[PDB]
Amino acid sequence: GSMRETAIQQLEADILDVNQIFKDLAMMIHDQGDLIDSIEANVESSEVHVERASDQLQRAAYYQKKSR
Amino acid sequence: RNDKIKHVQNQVDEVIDVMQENITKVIERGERLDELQDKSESLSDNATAFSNRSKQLRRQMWW
Amino acid sequence: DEQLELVSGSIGVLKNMSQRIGGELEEQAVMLEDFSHELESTQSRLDNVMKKLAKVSHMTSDR
Amino acid sequence: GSMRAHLLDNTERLERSSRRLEAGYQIAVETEQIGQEMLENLSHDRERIQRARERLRETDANLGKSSRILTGMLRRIIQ
């Protein structure tokens, strides 16, 4: 009967739900990319600084021996 | 007709079921990213403090 | 007519995409916990390296 | 009389119901472009996380190097 009319309405309504949930998920994932930006930058910085420090330590070592 | 609605509806309800779990995962993912950002943050802070202490060590060794 | 077949197909894919998403999210969850542990490790290494440093800084300019 | 009036109602109930399966289809297909986008997005992030995990290991290689250098300095401090 018309329970095929309502059902088709629930169907489309429910299809709108998925579309919404998909947008929602996409949005969430996209916004987290800024956290990844931070993490990425933080590690980069650590890498650069640990690398810089090791070279300062080699110079420190040299000076230690260059000190008789 | 009908059924091809029912057995096409809950097909949707299924996708809704998967996605719903997915947003629970993304929320979990956001939280782990949050902790990751805080830790890579201390590392960075510490990596820099380390670099500054190494420069001092060099100057100190040269004197 | 029966374009409900066209809807059922379309949705099926969504049912496909949603799962691959959940799988990938679960895979990254593992990958993020791993990254988290490596971070903790590196922090540790930094802490031990800085202690060695502070020690050398004393062993000389305090003798 | 109002007997074909019902045949007009019943027939319009069908028309828009067909326009609800046309919309229901358009929306889904649209949703397939988002779902795909997420997959493209997640792969990209997964790549950036692996790149960072990699960069961290290199930071480790340097902490190793600094540790060895410091040990060496600790030695020469005792002459």
Swiss-Prot record, chain A:
Location of the protein in the cell: Endosome membrane; Golgi apparatus membrane; Endomembrane system; Early endosome membrane
Quaternary structure annotation from Swiss-Prot or TrEMBL: Associates with the BLOC-1 complex. Interacts with BLOC1S6. Interacts with NAPA and SNAP23. Identified in a complex containing STX6, STX12, VAMP4 and VTI1A. Interacts with GRIPAP1. Forms a complex with GRIP1, GRIA2 and NSG1; controls the intracellular fate of AMPAR and the endosomal sorting of the GRIA2 subunit toward recycling and membrane targeting. Interacts with NSG1. Interacts with TPC1. Interacts (via N-terminus) with VPS13B.
Protein name as annotated: Syntaxin-12
Residues of the full protein shown: 184 to 248 of 274
Organism: Rattus norvegicus
Limits of the t-SNARE coiled-coil homology domain: 4-60
Domain of life: Eukaryota
Role of this protein: SNARE promoting fusion of transport vesicles with target membranes. Together with SNARE STX6, promotes movement of vesicles from endosomes to the cell membrane, and may therefore function in the endocytic recycling pathway. Through complex formation with GRIP1, GRIA2 and NSG1 controls the intracellular fate of AMPAR and the endosomal sorting of the GRIA2 subunit toward recycling and membrane targeting.
Tissue specificity remark: Ubiquitous. Highly expressed in brain.
Assigned protein family: Belongs to the syntaxin family.
Phosphoserine modifications at: S38, S45
UniProtKB/Swiss-Prot annotation, chain B:
Source taxon at top rank: Eukaryota
Location relative to the cell: Golgi apparatus, trans-Golgi network membrane
Modifications after synthesis and translation: (Microbial infection) Targeted and hydrolyzed by C.botulinum neurotoxin type X (BoNT/X) which hydrolyzes the 87-Arg-|-Ser-88 bond and probably inhibits neurotransmitter release. It remains unknown whether BoNT/X is ever produced, or what organisms it targets.
All copies of domain v-SNARE coiled-coil homology, residue ranges: 4-63
Residues of the site described as (Microbial infection) Cleavage: K39, S40
Role: Involved in the pathway that functions to remove an inhibitor (probably synaptotagmin-4) of calcium-triggered exocytosis during the maturation of secretory granules. May be a marker for this sorting pathway that is critical for remodeling the secretory response of granule.
Subunit text: Identified in a complex containing STX6, STX12, VAMP4 and VTI1A. Interacts with BAIAP3; this interaction is increased in the presence of calcium.
Family (UniProt): Belongs to the synaptobrevin family.
The protein's name: Vesicle-associated membrane protein 4
Swiss-Prot record, chain C:
GO biological process, one term: regulation of protein localization
Subunit annotation: Identified in a complex containing STX6, STX12, VAMP4 and VTI1A. Binds EEA1. Interacts with VPS45A. Interacts with MARCHF2; the interaction promotes MARCHF2-mediated ubiquitination and degradation of CFTR. Interacts with MARCHF3. Interacts with GOPC. Interacts with BLTP3B (via C-terminal coiled-coil domain). Interacts with BAIAP3; this interaction is increased in the presence of calcium. Interacts with VPS13B.
Gene: STX6
GO molecular function: SNAP receptor activity; SNARE binding; syntaxin binding
Keywords per UniProt: Acetylation, Coiled coil, Endosome, Golgi apparatus, Membrane, Phosphoprotein, Protein transport, Transmembrane, Transmembrane helix, Transport
Cystine crosslinks: none
Function: SNARE promoting movement of transport vesicles to target membranes. Targets endosomes to the trans-Golgi network, and may therefore function in retrograde trafficking. Together with SNARE STX12, promotes movement of vesicles from endosomes to the cell membrane, and may therefore function in the endocytic recycling pathway.
A Gene Ontology term for the protein's cellular component: endomembrane system
Protein name listed in UniProt: Syntaxin-6
Family indicated by similarity: Belongs to the syntaxin family.
Full protein segment contained here: 170 to 232 of 255
Primary location recorded for the protein, binned into one broad class: Golgi
Compartment(s) where it occurs, according to its Swiss-Prot or TrEMBL record: Golgi apparatus membrane; Golgi apparatus, trans-Golgi network membrane; Recycling endosome membrane
Domain annotation t-SNARE coiled-coil homology: ranges: 1-56
Organism encoding this protein: Homo sapiens
UniProtKB/Swiss-Prot annotation, chain D:
Subcellular location: Membrane; Cytoplasmic vesicle, Secretory vesicle, Synaptic vesicle membrane; Cytoplasmic vesicle, Clathrin-coated vesicle membrane; Golgi apparatus membrane
Coiled-coil features, chain-numbered ranges: 4-67
Highest rank taxon of the organism: Eukaryota
Tissue: Specifically expressed in the neuronal tissues cerebellum, cortex and hippocampus. Isoform 1/VTI1A is expressed in the same neuronal tissues but also in lung, liver, kidney and spleen.
Function: V-SNARE that mediates vesicle transport pathways through interactions with t-SNAREs on the target membrane. These interactions are proposed to mediate aspects of the specificity of vesicle trafficking and to promote fusion of the lipid bilayers. Involved in vesicular transport from the late endosomes to the trans-Golgi network. Along with VAMP7, involved in an non-conventional RAB1-dependent traffic route to the cell surface used by KCNIP1 and KCND2. May be concerned with increased secretion of cytokines associated with cellular senescence.
Family: Belongs to the VTI1 family.
Subunit structure: Interacts with distinct SNARE complexes that contain either STX5 or STX6. Interacts with NAPA and, to a lesser extent, with NAPG. Identified in a complex containing STX6, STX12, VAMP4 and VTI1A.
Name this protein carries in UniProt: Vesicle transport through interaction with t-SNAREs homolog 1A
Annotated organism of origin: Rattus norvegicus
